[PDB]
Structures are given as C-alpha cells and as structure tokens.
C-alpha cells in the first residue's frame with residue numbers, strides 16, 4: 001500500500017494549458033484530460049467507444065450519488081437504448097468547460113481509475129481505485145477550447161469527488177498534493193499525491209531535498225466553489241507598490257489559463273508602473289493578448305524586481321523575469337500579464353505560466369500553500385527532473 | 392442677450408457646506424439655498440407666507456409637468472385652503488434633503504428666477520427666467536441639517552429641470568458650467584454658466600486665461616440618478632498606489648465637506664499614508680478623522696497625494712494644504728473619512744476637495760476639467776479669479 | 782447673431798397622405814427626407830455604411846449625452862464586424878418606432894450637425910446650425926415599410942428631452958412654442974415654425 005502517487009502532466013504548446021493521460025476502465029486505457037486545478041470532478045465524453053467490464057452508472061438516491069452531492073435525477077433524451085452516459089433513473093451532475101465556461105448535465109459514472117505508485121527512486125506499479133466516481137459529460141462540452149484530442153478534464157478542486165480527495169480516501173494518504181508543471185512541451189511535469197516529508201518516501205523525493213528545505217508558506221483559503229486562494233497584499237516593482245483593496249484571499253490560483261490575469265484597474269496601474277521602470281525606447285508594437293512589449297535585444301538584463309507581497313507581509317513570492325517576460329514573437333518580449341476586464345473573477349488570477357517550473361505544495365491538513373523560495377534552476381533542477389518520471 | 396451668467400456662492404463655516412442667495416419672485420427677493428451639485432431640481436419651502444405676483448402651480452398633465460417629468464397628480468392634504476405648495480389637481484415632485492437624506496413630496500411650482508449677467512470685467516444686470524420651474528417642498532424638509540436660515544437647495548444635477556438645464560435653454564447658452572468654491576467663509580466663490588472660452592466673454596474671464604489654458608480633462612459619466620462621476624484608477628502616496636474598487640468610481644458632490652472613502656479603501660489608504668509619515672508623530676484621532684498628527688512635528692514634509700485617472704491620462708494632484716485638516720489646536724488630521732461598508736461609492740469627493748479649484752463641467756463633450764497647477768501658483772484664488780463685486 | 786424664429790418647410794405625400802421634410806444634416810451639409818411625426822420622442826435615421834460626416838460622433842455609454850437622451854442602457858453592435866455610424870460597442874441604445882407600422886427597433890444614440898432656416902426680414906434667411914444635435918441611428922428595416930417613398934426616418938416633435946423642438950428651443954434660446962401649418966397639396970409646401978410668432 002503506497003504512501004505516494006504520481007501523475008505526469010504535459011504542457012500543450014499551442015494553448016499553454018496542461019493535460020494528462022488518465023488510465024481508466026477494464027481493460028485499462030489512457031484518456032487525455034485537461035488539468036483543472038479548481039475543477040470539482042473528473043469528467044469525460046462517454047458516448048464514444050466506451051468499452052469496459054467494470055463500468056456502472058449509480059442509481060438515483062444511491063450512496064454514490066450522495067457522496068457526489070447530486071440529488072437530481074437523470075433522464076436520457078438522446079439514444080432510446082442504454083449505454084454509458086445514457087440511462088434513466090441515474091443522477092445528474094453538472095460539468096463545466098473551464099476554458100469556454102460552458103456547462104452541461106452529465107451522468108454520474110463509476111469505473112476503474114489507475115495511477116503510478118513509486119518504487120525506491122523510480123515510478124512503481126500502477127495501483128487502482130476500482131470504483132472511481134466521475135461524470136459522463138455531453139459531447140459538445142469538450143469540442144471547443146481544450147488541447148487537441150483532449151476529451152474532458154480532471155479536477156483537483158475542494159469538492160467531495162475531486163481526484164485528489166478520492167485518492168486520499170482510498171489509499172489513506174496524507175491530505176497534501178504538490179504541483180510541478182513543466183514549461184516545455186517536450187518534457188513532463190508532475191502532480192504528487194501524499195506526504196513528501198514521509199521518511200517512507202525519502203528515496204523518491206531524495207533528489208528534491210534542497211528545494212524542500214527552502215520552501216516558503218502562506219495561508220490557503222477556499223471559496224464556496226472549491227477554488228484555491230491566497231492573499232496578495234501588494235505587487236512590488238522595484239520600490240513601487242501596486243496595492244489592491246477573516247476573508248478569502250484576493251489571488252486565485254488556476255491552471256485553466258496560461259497567463260496571469262489582472263482585473264482592469266490593477267492591470268492599468270500595474271502595467272504603467274512596469275513601463276515606467278523600463279526603457280521607453282525599447283517598446284515595440286504590442287503583440288497577442290499582451291499590452292506591453294519590448295524588442296528583446298534591448299531589455300536584456302534590464303527587467304525589474306517583480307514580487308508578490310503575501311498575507312500579512314510575512315512572505316514574498318519573488319517572480320523571475322524569465323517567467324514574467326514572454327517571447328510573443330521572434331525578437332519580441334512581452335510583459336506576461338493580461339487584462340481581465342472590469343468583471344473579473346478575482347483581482348489577481350495566477351495561471352499556468354506562473355506555476356511552471358516551480359514546486360507548489362497544497363497542504364490541506366494545515367490549510368497552507370508552500371513554494372520554492374529560490375528558482376529551481378538555482379538548484380540545477382527543473383520540474384521535469386526533480387522527480388524520476390520515467391515509467 | 393447674455394453668454395455667461397454668474398452665481399456667487401458662500402461657505403458656511405459651521406457645516407462646511409456652501410449656499411447661495413437666489414433671486415426669485417415678483418417683487419424680486421433673496422432666498423438662501425444649499426448648493427447641491429447632484430440635485431435634480433431646485434426646491435424651497437412654500438407656505439401661505441409666500442408672496443409673488445408671478446407664482447403658478449402648473450396643472451396635472453400640463454406641458455410644465457411633462458418637462459419636469461412628473462405625471463403623478465398632487466393632492467394637498469395639509470392646509471384645507473389653497474396656498475403656494477398646497478393645491479389639488481397639480482403635480483407632485485419628490486424632493487430630497489441631501490444631508491439628512493430625508494425626502495418629501497412637493498408641488499411643482501413656476502415663478503421668476505433672476506441671475507447676474509456680466510458687463511465688461513464686472514457683474515452685469517440681473518437677467519430673468521420668468522417661468523422657472525421648481526418644487527414647493529413641505530416645511531419640515533429643510534428644518535434639519537442645513538446652514539442657518541437656508542430654506543431649500545438648488546440642484547445642478549443631470550435631470551430635466553435642474554437649474555443649469557433651465558438657464559441653458561432659456562438663454563441659449565453653451566452646455567457647460569464651472570465651479571470655483573472659496574475655502575473661506577469670509578469671501579465668495581462662484582458658479583459660472585455658459586462658455587468660458589467665448590471671446591465675447593473674454594473681458595469678464597480675462598483674469599483667468601492662464602488657468603484655462605492649462606486645464607486638464609477626464610471623462611465624465613452620469614448615473615441613472617443624475618450624479619457626476621469620474622474614474623480614479625489609483626490613489627498614489629509617494630510610490631505606493633492604492634487601487635480602488637462603465638460609470639466612474641469616484642462621485643463628485645457638494646453635500647458633505649470631507650472626502651469619504653468606503654471602508655475597505657479607507658483602511659488601506661490610511662495605513663499606507665501612515666507608512667509614508669513619521670510613525671511616532673501620531674496623536675489620538677480627533678473629530679471625524681482617523682489619523683491625526685501633532686502640527687509642530689510634521690511641518691517637516693507631507694507626502695505626494697495624487698488621483699490617477701481614467702486611462703492614466705490625467706492626474707488630479709491634491710495639495711497638502713487641501714487634504715490636511717487642522718482638527719484642533721495643534722492637531723492636523725488626514726481629511727478623509729470612513730464611509731463604512733455600505734458606502735454609496737468607493738470614493739466621494741466633497742466640498743473641501745473642490746475648494747480653491749476651478750472645476751469645469753463640460754456637458755457638451757462629457758468631460759470634467761480642472762486646474763493643473765494650484766490657483767495660488769497663478770496668484771489667484773476662487774474669490775478673485777472673477778470679479779464678484781456688486 | 783441668434784435667430785428668434787426658425788422655419789421648416791414640410792410637404793404632403795399624396796399616396797400615403799403623410800407629410801415629410803428634407804432635413805439638413807452632417808458636414809458637409811446634406812438633405813435627408815424624414816416623416817413628420819408630431820408625437821415622436823426623437824429624430825431617427827437609418828444610418829448606413831455610406832454615412833459621410835466629419836462632425837459625427839456616437840456618445841459613449843453613461844455620457845452626459847446619454848443622460849440627456851434619457852437612456853442608460855448600453856449598446857452592443859451584434860451586426861457588422863467593423864464599426865460604422867449606428868454600429869459601435871460601448872455606446873447607448875435607444876428604442877425607435879415606425880409610427881405607421883408600430884414596429885420598433887433598438888438604435889444607437891448619435892450626434893451630428895443639424896441645420897434649419899432662420900428668417901431674414903419677411904423672407905427665409907440663412908441656415909443656422911445645431912452642431913451637436915442628438916438623434917437615433919436606427920436599424921434599417923424600420924424605414925422599409927409604411928413611409929413615403931425614399932423617406933429614411935422620422936422627426937419627432939413630442940414632449941420628450943431630445944425631441945426636435947426641445948433641442949432647437951434650448952440651443953438658440955427660443956420661446957417654447959411651435960406652430961404647424963400643413964399644406965393639403967403635394968405640389969406646394971406647408972411649414973413648421975419654431976419660436977414666438979406673436980412679436981410683430
């Protein structure tokens with residue numbers, strides 16, 4: 001019985017989103033799914049080639065339906081014969097495409113999910129959750145916005161049948177998971193489930209020990225919708241402070257958009273403050289979703305300190321200029337923050353690009369988030385080689 | 392045929408609010424009324440003691456009631472005899488005390504209003520609007536909260552029978568008015584109606600020409616209730632920027648003296664301010680204020696406070712002689728007040744903010760203009776920018 | 782230099798029995814045939830791709846112009862993929878009516894030059910302008926039915942804040958009075974007069 005589980009994830013270069021192959025069903029196979037940090041559950045298109053000797057659709061008012069927190073019954077109005085995703089007297093579950101913000105009523109489903117354990121310092125054998133709960137979503141939901149051929153999403157949000165909650169409870173793990181996304185499409189990053197500070201896991205996490213010793217922590221708050229928040233008191237640029245006005249933190253953490261999104265007033269003030277701490281004669285025609293771009297040849301070694309001042313000024317998340325400068329085009333380097341408009345979900349939403357090449361620990365038992373206080377590269381490490389991810 | 396009209400206004404030392412004598416009725420006489428920038432109409436208390444040979448109460452469904460945008464008929468339930476403010480089959484108008492936020496149903500009224508024209512560099516003869524529309528309010532409405540002897544309010548809001556809307560239309564003026572409040576109770580400020588860049592008016596406004604050339608503008612937005620808003624992206628204190636929070640987020644108003652901030656913004660701004668000051672010069676807060684200092688110790692230097700505006704095109708610099716208030720003896724307080732958690736807006740700029748500034752409401756281009764340097768840097772004040780002498 | 786009386790010639794359409802006027806608008810100034818609608822709340826025009834004017838503007842939502850027009854509903858162009866008069870985002874929406882068909886449609890608030898005759902002695906005098914006249918750019922279908930031939934909108938003289946007379950009264954400081962003398966014959970004009978007719 002494993003004390004640590006590992007899910008390799010990959011960056012999609014085109015969308016900037018991350019996805020994973022999930023192993024499901026009997027016989028076991030791989031389903032490519034979007035990584036959705038705040039997603040309430042795993043959902044898939046089932047109307048396909050769903051072949052499994054282990055599939056079940058729980059009946060309405062069943063114990064499975066109570067756990068999934070759906071007490072709404074499902075009626076199939078597509079096929080008039082039965083299949084995965086289409087029954088009467090089952091239960092309905094609302095699934096959302098976090099990119100398009102579309103939602104649709106899916107059917108609660110139950111089948112095998114499998115995930116890697118560890119063996120010494122390498123990946124170990126797959127272990128199974130034989131009755132993993134998830135949603136069979138309507139086909140349209142995955143037809144737009146996801147990486148190519150991605151057929152659903154896996155959610156890691158604070159909700160009862162999230163992926164991590166089901167792994168924790170099945171295997172009796174510590175309630176902690178860690179995210180190390182890779183910036184490169186050509187090598188994987190990973191998600192780790194369980195305690196990384198467990199001597200039983202020392203051999204697998206041995207290579208990451210210098211990083212772990214320097215981890216910095218800040219309190220984690222959770223919204224009514226199961227989303228992860230931290231408190232950012234200010235954004236510091238050199239000696240300028242952009243200061244936003246028992247509550248949930250103001251900064252969302254998400255994996256479902258690449259760049260960090262700022263509500264309009266913050267975006268406006270921050271970007272100008274940034275432009276003021278830069279050579280005005282280095283700017284070029286704005287490109288892409290970005291508002292402030294430079295000719296890459298100037299600027300070289302000329303970007304300012306950009307830091308998040310965190311809850312109660314106890315901590316700082318220093319952000320590297322190799323992270324916050326984006327290479328929009330051949331020789332064009334852009335400030336990687338985008339305007340969320342005036343009705344943004346949060347004042348600040350830290351996205352996949354922010355998380356990439358950082359180790360970020362979601363410590364649910366103590367309600368806090370930890371991150372590397374120095375860049376991984378300063379340890380000679382990357383998110384792809386911090387842990388052994390060869391099968 | 393005048394191109395510019397002038398209304399002198401005065402600060403009430405006690406309340407910090409401003410008022411004007413309006414000339415009305417036949418025979419012409421003076422009515423002291425509160426200056427209410429956002430008010431929808433002029434209202435005055437009416438009784439059997441109201442005397443005028445030109446007063447009328449328009450009938451219900453009249454063209455007058457139509458222009459005033461009231462189609463609710465009025466029934467007098469007070470006197471059992473008719474008098475100004477008390478008739479049947481007239482029309483009803485809701486009037487508000489902007490200070491107490493009490494409101495009352497008045498009767499639409501019509502009478503003479505007079506206001507100064509200009510003659511060269513001086514005030515010229517009074518010119519009249521013989522059928523000025525306004526509200527006869529119930530007597531109780533002004534009985535609390537207004538400066539002494541003030542018996543109504545003149546409203547300059549975006550609403551069909553506001554004072555400026557009726558002056559514009561009657562005289563064929565450019566749709567613009569300018570506010571120059573005087574900080575001193577002992578000298579008048581003014582409101583100007585019509586084009587101030589009008590060569591015809593060059594002689595009256597000649598003394599202000601340097602101020603006008605350097606005016607800075609920002610977009611003006613109007614709420615559904617007719618209030619004036621601008622957009623503030625940040626309040627800057629030295630190098631610390633406080634980001635507040637489409638209609639602008641900052642209300643402009645004349646019905647409270649000090650600038651009111653919503654609780655979350657207030658808390659953030661006052662601490663940021665305390666961080667840019669000698670932290671051990673503070674004294675127990677006095678009055679309505681939250682952060683007060685000893686006057687002898689901070690004469691050293693107050694920090695830069697600027698409103699960063701819409702699209703960051705413009706900056707409204709606030710002088711430390713404006714935002715520091717001398718609450719007591721040797722105590723100077725930061726003159727921003729906490730509007731609480733159900734504040735109407737995030738920022739509400741009040742009379743104190745407006746004082747000794749020239750503020751132009753350009754309704755024709757939907758923008759607000761203000762002096763980009765202090766009046767005092769031009770050798771001017773709001774009392775002497777224009778000739779307000781009889 | 783401010784006229785005390787303005788005059789708008791109007792003509793009867795024999796086919797429909799309705800009356801219309803050529804109204805002068807834009808820079809450079811040109812004529813638009815519009816239906817005479819006594820009770821109409823505002824002037825509206827079908828505004829097209831080929832609207833040409835150097836003085837045209839679409840007020841922004843929550844502007845003072847939108848306040849005066851009494852509209853606080855914002856406009857979104859759900860039509861073209863490019864902007865044109867009558868088609869922008871972040872402007873304000875105004876409901877216009879075809880009084881013959883009772884069709885209504887949501888237009889965009891617009892601002893441009895309007896000109897009209899003043900008087901000179903006993904004759905018509907030079908055109909005088911309202912440089913920022915407020916009106917509605919209405920959807921094209923709204924004029925396709927019921928109106929005289931080639932008529933592209935209506936001018937309203939109703940009791941409403943941006944009616945035609947209300948804007949003329951206030952721009953020029955006229956007496957609040959207008960007079961109607963319609964002609965029975967399609968072959969000669971009648972007129973609308975704005976201002977005091979009784980100061981001989």
Ligand SMILES: *[C@@H]1O[C@H](CO)[C@@H](O[C@@H]2O[C@H](CO)[C@@H](O)[C@H](O)[C@H]2NC(C)=O)[C@H](O[C@@H]2O[C@@H](C)[C@@H](O)[C@@H](O)[C@@H]2O)[C@H]1NC(C)=O
Pocket residue numbers: 466467470471472473478479
């Ligand atoms: C305004 O209209 C009211 C309703 O018509 C008037 O009140 C009515 O007076 C009648 C005469 O005595 C009486 O029979 C009715 O019952 C009464 N109606 C109500 C609703 O009370 C009112 O008249 C004045 O006030 C009343 C109470 C009496 O004192 C009358 O003599 C008064 O004229 C009208 N007010 C005017 C015309 O000023």
Ligand SMILES: *[C@@H]1O[C@H](CO)[C@@H](O[C@@H]2O[C@H](CO)[C@@H](O)[C@H](O)[C@H]2NC(C)=O)[C@H](O)[C@H]1NC(C)=O
Pocket residue numbers: 857858861862863864868869870
């Ligand atoms: C007015 O705004 C709308 C909505 O913002 C624009 O319509 C969208 O244009 C985007 C392009 O950025 C498309 O991706 C959307 O599919 C469009 N939505 C709809 C409903 O058509 C529209 O282009 C804007 N119009 C103008 C003239 O700027």
Ligand SMILES: *[C@@H]1O[C@H](CO)[C@@H](O)[C@H](O)[C@H]1NC(C)=O
Pocket residue numbers: 075076079080081082086087088
């Ligand atoms: C679901 O119920 C409806 C209504 O009774 C029925 O017509 C339909 O065939 C049922 N669906 C399946 C898959 O049996």
